From Swiss-Prot, chain A:
The organism of origin for this protein: Homo sapiens
Inhibition and activation profile: NMDA glutamate receptor activity is inhbited by Mg2(+) in a voltage-dependent manner; Mg2(+)-induced blockade occurs only at negative potentials and decreases with membrane depolarization. 7-chlorokynurenate (50 uM) or Zn2(+) (100 uM) partially inhibit the NMDA glutamate receptor activity, while acide 2-amino-5-phosphonovalerique(100 uM) almost completely blocked the NMDA glutamate receptor activity. Dizocilpine (1 uM) results in long lasting and almost complete block of the NMDA glutamate receptor activity.
Modification after translation: NMDA is probably regulated by C-terminal phosphorylation of an isoform of GRIN1 by PKC. Its phosphorylated state is influenced by the formation of the NMDAR-PPP2CB complex and the NMDAR channel activity.
Reactions catalysed according to its record: Ca(2+)(in) = Ca(2+)(out); Na(+)(in) = Na(+)(out); K(+)(in) = K(+)(out)
UniProt KW keywords: Calcium, Cell membrane, Disease variant, Disulfide bond, Epilepsy, Glycoprotein, Intellectual disability, Ion channel, Ion transport, Ligand-gated ion channel, Magnesium, Membrane, Metal-binding, Phosphoprotein, Postsynaptic cell membrane, Receptor, Signal, Synapse, Transmembrane, Transmembrane helix, Transport, Zinc
Keyword Transmembrane: yes
Covered range of the whole protein: 26 to 522 of 938
Name this polypeptide is given: Glutamate receptor ionotropic, NMDA 1
Swiss-Prot record, chain C:
UniProt free text on domains: A hydrophobic region that gives rise to the prediction of a transmembrane span does not cross the membrane, but is part of a discontinuously helical region that dips into the membrane and is probably part of the pore and of the selectivity filter.
Residue intervals annotated with topology Extracellular: 1-383
Portion of the full-length sequence here: 52 to 446 of 1336
Upper taxonomic lineage: Eukaryota, Metazoa, Chordata, Craniata, Vertebrata
Protein's UniProt name: Glutamate receptor ionotropic, NMDA 2D
Subunit structure comment from the entry: Heterotetramer. Forms heterotetrameric channels composed of two GluN1/zeta subunits (GRIN1), and two identical GluN2/epsilon subunits (GRIN2A, GRIN2B, GRIN2C or GRIN2D) or GluN3 subunits (GRIN3A or GRIN3B) (in vitro). In vivo, the subunit composition may depend on the expression levels of the different subunits. Interacts with PDZ domains of PATJ and DLG4.
From Swiss-Prot, chain D:
Coiled coil: none
Processing and modification events after translation: NMDA is probably regulated by C-terminal phosphorylation of an isoform of GRIN1 by PKC. Its phosphorylated state is influenced by the formation of the NMDAR-PPP2CB complex and the NMDAR channel activity.
Comment block on domains: A hydrophobic region that gives rise to the prediction of a transmembrane span does not cross the membrane, but is part of a discontinuously helical region that dips into the membrane and is probably part of the pore and of the selectivity filter.
Oligomer and partners: Heterotetramer; the NMDAR subunits are modular and harbor tiered domains that function in concert to regulate opening and closing of the cation-selective ion channel pore. Forms heterotetrameric channels composed of two GluN1/zeta subunits (GRIN1), and two identical GluN2/epsilon subunits (GRIN2A, GRIN2B, GRIN2C or GRIN2D) or GluN3 subunits (GRIN3A or GRIN3B) (in vitro). Can also form heterotetrameric channels that contain at least two GluN1 subunits and at least two different GluN2 subunits (or a combination of one GluN2 and one GluN3 subunits) (in vitro).
Described purpose of this protein according to its UniProt entry: Component of N-methyl-D-aspartate (NMDA) receptors (NMDARs) that function as heterotetrameric, ligand-gated cation channels with high calcium permeability and voltage-dependent block by Mg(2+). NMDARs participate in synaptic plasticity for learning and memory formation by contributing to the long-term potentiation (LTP). Channel activation requires binding of the neurotransmitter L-glutamate to the GluN2 subunit, glycine or D-serine binding to the GluN1 subunit, plus membrane depolarization to eliminate channel inhibition by Mg(2+).
Protein name per UniProt: Glutamate receptor ionotropic, NMDA 1
Glycosylation sites: 13
Binding site for glycine: 27
């Protein structure tokens, strides 16, 4: 006989869960119990400790109650399970902090977290090949985990994003970052934030021309909910779990996985401790059960095969890609594990673009930094040629007087100036001409208070993106 | 004879009689740093580099600087323009002055074509003959 | 409004005597009582007693001392702090050095500092002595990636070479012996690696070249009676074992608790009296709206100094610029005192380095020649 | 001037105007073979070495 338990306050799913586990025991390859979700977290911890003292629970099952309690519900039971290194599983754990092995290592997520949702987004990028991607994610631990996962995946793909936008939850005037990122050449924006944060950022974007042509945002499941859907511009892409918020299917899959795990455990030739009270020391068999659970897996469940990762999270899980057509999340794609399937080719972009807009946004304000080289760049503080033709001495600011640091506009005219004006006449590109304060080309120099060698001067500024391109008598070198 | 060429012993053997200098943080400086068998020249640069090309030209013109290693075209034009100076050593490192843009910049290709257009149009040497190589001292 | 939590019953009476000597009996912020939690076995009754005390007198500062330095209890403290918004202190615990990411309203504020500071102290000692780290021994414990990133950053910044990153899981000992490793920077938990320590002792890793250095999460952390392991010495020394720990390695546990209580009282004073306010915090162990808010009093702790220790604590409740002690497990199977680190300054033994540091010199591995020299023409110039 | 010294360009740059030679199978020949940046001098040796010092 194996004593197992689950946590759920529906008061009706307990009977179906018991029937499912009994059927799994009869077929696959033992008494079960259920715990109601206590309102108070301390009360829930006391109840779970009492249950563990009374019953030597091998693994607990936890899901978010229908009443929205955010992340308060699963913390006490997760801490109790991790105290004795008891490998337990959750159902609706969409947060990546539980996936972390720091404190909640004893938690197995039957569903991929929100951070993993960013991964398919890169595949979403591969759907349309729009490398001009920017990130607008709230400065949250789960948000930071999603951002770093996306950064690692793009580094593997060698496709650097345009930038990243961090907004503290609950803060207003988020239009500052929106305007600071609007001028960039990116046309597709990746966002992931809480429901209130999502609604705030959608309202801010709609406030100042951020939903027009060349504007599109893809967000996770948590963002597409509540009144944010009403405030969401039409055509905004979203991702949802393939199983949705279906508790019965998750319960059946978890029952099958637990049956497989206990069938594998029964083969072990070498028990839970003496409850929450008395036996302070953890059970030596707890780590062994966790290891065999990592080794074991679930195949051909109610929602298909559920193959947990090294952290105990289902891999290649399907998802539904929805588009906000006619103010409804119409079915437009299926992310089958890893493969995109455009079930309905009726995607209308938020800017009213029936076609797929290019991820690149046209830019003409070409910023050119220069270095004062008299044969190439004649600079005079603020005339005609020998033949009387006018000299194109354009206005060029940036020199801080004597390198007390007075940036003054001067007249620039020379070889590089002639070349750049000829270009601007050729392909019709506007230009903003400026100089560099350091007055050096630059090199890889391990400067003070630095770890490695960093490019300096004009090349350093160009690498940093200060100027669009360098127009100077520069020697071609592979460095 | 100060320097008869690239093989001149003074170029090979550093000494305090001459002051070899280049502009600080320059491609020529990095090339000399990576140039084998001439780490002595790199030390001479480190101990005697000029902060700018203009100051080096002024020092050479009035004999503070005995020698200034610099690109052929610009140094030759400066010597012709200001006179009172000479250039030694042939084009021992042939190179080109082009354009530099961000990685995978779509416009750069066009610029490259435009470069050829200039070579077709002569605009580079047009501006040269306009204001470079005729008002010699 | 002071509560003391402990797991060692024999330290009961002293807690009622040594405690008040550096407490509100002599400390101003008390102005107009000290509580002792006798429970040191299970957190259920402990949390019940804490809630009872909070309902009774609304204790401001509560400190828990761990006899066995068990890290599994720290999540319970974090949960309680998130539930009641009560500032807490955790001393004599292994998890004190572990900077667990707490909840937004949590005020765990552990006594121990970040293990990265101990790592940088070890790296400073190396830069004094050894400019190349041979093997970084690491298990699958949490924070291993952070440890790897920190050692990589430190080595790249100071230009320190690498030889091996021994991310371990007999056979393991044989695989470790397969790499030419001399300096062993080990970051492993005591319980899991204790068989690994025994195997390394039995695998011949006690050679002259093979030098092992321990960390805070190992048996080095925690002072007083000693670290039992397999108390004065713990695991066998692989002929030159090194370690680092907090300044409480030789300081009294009761005196450290009293100092922490005084620091908490001074911070409470610098908050309330300077703000002219009254104590209005989470005064219940139930569910309410006020449980959704919290803050860290580290913003009122930089104005505190005592026993030559800074107190400008960080947001994560760890001390910035702490005082640490580096120790050696000599052949006498006892922990010596290599020296102390404070304010990026090292007070150590004679820092001479001629294959020095570990007394088992690498002379056998790398030949050392007594190069006799005389001062003469600039071909040999002394300065 | 044929050769003003070790840095003479004629020593650096081989040509048919001069015939640089050394005794075949000699220590100087092997040193020039192992001498870097002067493989041209080694080729000049190979194509113009003297069989003996007396004949040279």
């Amino acid at each position: 006989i194996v004593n197992i338990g689950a946590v759920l306050s529906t008061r009706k799913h307990e009977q179906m869960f018991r029937e499912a586990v009994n059927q799994a025991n009869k077929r696959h390859g033992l008494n079960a119990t259920s715990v109601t979700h206590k309102p108070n977290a301390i009360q829930m911890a006391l109840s779970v400790c009492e249950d563990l003292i009374s019953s030597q629970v091998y693994a607990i099952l936890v899901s978010h109650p229908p009443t929205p309690n955010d992340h308060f519900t699963p913390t006490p039971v997760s801490y109790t399970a991790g105290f004795y290194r008891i490998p337990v599983l959750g159902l609706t754990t969409r947060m990546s902090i539980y996936s972390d092995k720091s404190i909640h290592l004893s938690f197995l997520r039957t569903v991929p977290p929100y951070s993993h949702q960013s991964s398919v987004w890169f595949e979403m990028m591969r759907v349309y090949s729009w490398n001009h991607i920017i990130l607008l994610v709230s400065d949250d631990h789960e948000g930071r985990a999603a951002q770093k996962r996306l950064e690692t995946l793009l580094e593997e793909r060698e496709s650097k994003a345009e930038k990243v936008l961090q907004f503290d939850p609950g803060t207003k005037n988020v239009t500052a970052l929106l305007m600071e990122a609007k001028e960039l050449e990116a046309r597709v924006i990746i966002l992931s934030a809480s429901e209130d944060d999502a609604a705030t950022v959608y309202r801010a974007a709609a406030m100042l021309n951020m939903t027009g042509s060349g504007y599109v945002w893809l967000v996770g499941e948590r963002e597409i909910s509540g009144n944010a859907l009403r405030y969401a511009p039409d055509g905004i892409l979203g991702l949802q779990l393939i199983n949705g918020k279906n508790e019965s299917a998750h319960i059946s899959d978890a029952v099958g996985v637990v049956a497989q795990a206990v069938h594998e455990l029964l083969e072990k030739e070498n028990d839970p401790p003496r409850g929450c009270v008395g036996n302070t020391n953890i059970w030596k068999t707890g780590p062994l059960f966790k290891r065999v659970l990592m080794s074991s897996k679930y195949a051909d469940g109610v929602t298909g095969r559920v193959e947990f990762n090294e952290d105990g999270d289902r891999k290649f899980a399907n998802y539904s890609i929805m588009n906000l057509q006619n103010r409804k999340l119409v079915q437009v794609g299926i992310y089958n594990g890893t493969h995109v399937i455009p079930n309905d080719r009726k995607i209308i972009w938020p800017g009213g673009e029936t076609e797929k807009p290019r991820g690149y946004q046209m830019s003409t304000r070409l910023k050119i930094v220069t270095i004062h080289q008299e044969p190439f760049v004649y600079v005079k503080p603020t005339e005609f040629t020998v033949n009387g033709d006018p000299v194109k001495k354009v206005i060029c600011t940036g020199p801080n007087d004597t390198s007390p640091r007075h940036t003054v506009p001067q007249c620039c005219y020379g070889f590089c100036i002639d070349l750049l004006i000829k270009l601007a006449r050729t392909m019709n590109f506007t230009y903003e001409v400026h100089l560099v304060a350091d007055g050096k080309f630059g090199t890889q120099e391990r400067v003070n208070n630095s770890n490695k060698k960093e490019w300096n001067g004009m090349m350093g500024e160009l690498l940093s993106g200060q100027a669009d391109m360098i127009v100077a008598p520069l020697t071609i070198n592979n460095e | 004879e100060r320097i008869t060429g690239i093989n001149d012993p003074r170029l090979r053997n550093p000494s305090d009689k001459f002051i070899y200098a280049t502009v600080k943080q320059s491609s020529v400086d990095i090339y000399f740093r990576r140039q084998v068998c001439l780490s002595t020249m790199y030390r001479h640069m480190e101990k005697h580099n000029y902060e700018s090309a203009a100051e080096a030209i002024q020092a050479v013109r009035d004999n503070k600087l005995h020698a200034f290693i610099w690109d052929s075209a610009v140094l030759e034009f400066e010597a012709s323009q200001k006179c009172d100076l000479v250039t030694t050593g042939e084009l021992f490192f042939r190179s080109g002055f082009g354009i530099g843009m961000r990685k995978d910049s779509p416009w750069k290709q066009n610029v490259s074509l435009s470069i050829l257009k200039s070579h077709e149009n002569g605009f580079m040497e047009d501006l040269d003959k306009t204001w470079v190589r005729y008002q010699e001292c | 409004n002071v509560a003391l939590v402990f797991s060692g019953p024999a330290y009961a009476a002293e807690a009622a005597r040594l405690g008040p000597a550096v407490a509100a009996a002599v400390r101003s912020p008390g102005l107009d009582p000290v509580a002792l939690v006798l429970n040191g076995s299970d957190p259920r009754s402990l949390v019940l007693q804490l809630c009872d005390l909070l309902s009774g007198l609304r204790v401001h500062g509560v400190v828990f001392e761990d006899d066995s330095r068990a890290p599994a209890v720290a999540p319970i403290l974090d949960f309680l702090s998130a539930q009641t918004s009560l500032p807490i202190v955790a001393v004599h615990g292994g998890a004190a050095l572990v900077l667990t990411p707490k909840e937004k309203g949590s005020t765990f504020l552990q006594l121990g500092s970040s293990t990265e500071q101990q790592l940088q102290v070890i790296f400073e000692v190396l830069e004094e002595y050894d400019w190349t780290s041979f093997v970084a021994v690491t298990t699958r414990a949490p924070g291993h990636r952070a440890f790897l990133s920190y050692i990589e950053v430190l080595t790249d910044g100071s230009l320190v070479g690498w030889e091996h990153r021994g991310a371990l899981t007999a056979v393991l000992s044989a695989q470790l012996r397969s790499v030419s490793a001399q300096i062993r920077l080990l970051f492993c938990a005591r319980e899991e690696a204790e068989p690994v320590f025994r195997a390394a002792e039995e695998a011949g890793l006690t050679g002259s070249g093979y030098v092992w250095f321990m960390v805070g999460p190992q048996l080095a952390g925690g002072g007083g009676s000693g670290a039992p392991g397999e108390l004065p010495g713990g695991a066998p020394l692989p002929a030159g074992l090194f370690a680092v720990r907090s300044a409480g390695w030789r300081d009294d546990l009761a005196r450290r608790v009293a100092a922490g209580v005084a620091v908490v009282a001074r911070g409470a004073q610098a908050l309330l009296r300077d703000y002219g306010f009254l104590p209005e915090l989470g005064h219940d162990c139930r569910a309410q709206n006020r449980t959704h808010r919290g803050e860290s009093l580290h913003r009122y702790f930089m104005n505190i100094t005592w026993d030559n220790r800074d107190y400008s604590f960080n947001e994560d409740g760890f001390l910035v610029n702490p005082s640490l002690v580096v120790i050696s497990l000599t052949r006498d199977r006892t922990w010596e005192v290599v020296g102390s680190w404070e304010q990026q300054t090292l007070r150590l033994k004679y820092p001479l380095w001629s294959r020095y540091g570990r007394f088992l010199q690498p002379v056998d591995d790398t030949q050392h020649l007594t190069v006799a020299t005389l001062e003469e023409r600039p071909f040999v110039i002394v300065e």
